[PDB]
Amino acid sequence: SGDRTRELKVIDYREYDNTVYFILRDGDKIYTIEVSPEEAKKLKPGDWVIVNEDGKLLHVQGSLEHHHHHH
Numbered sequence: 675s676g677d678r679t680r681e682l683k684v685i686d687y688r689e690y691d692n693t694v695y696f697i698l699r700d701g702d703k704i705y706t707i708e709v710s711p712e713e714a715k716k717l718k719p720g721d722w723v724i725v726n727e728d729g730k731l732l733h734v735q736g737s738l739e740h741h742h743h744h745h
C-alpha cells in the first residue's frame with residue numbers, strides 16, 4: 675500500500691513559441707510532457723516533479739526536518 679505517486683527528474687526540455695516539452699526520467703524510464711510556457715517558468719533540468727492525475731506539474735521543493743519524536 676502507498677507508493678502511488680511517481681517523482682520524476684527533468685533531464686531536458688525543448689522550447690517553442692507556445693509550448694515546452696519536458697523530458698522526465700523515472701529510474702530507467704523516460705516520459706515526455708508538453709505544457710504551456712507559463713507552466714514551465716519555474717522548472718529547469720535537474721529539478722524534480724510529480725505529475726498528478728490531471729496533468730498538473732507539482733514542483734518538488736525538498737524535505738522537511740524531523741529530528742524529534744512527537745508521540
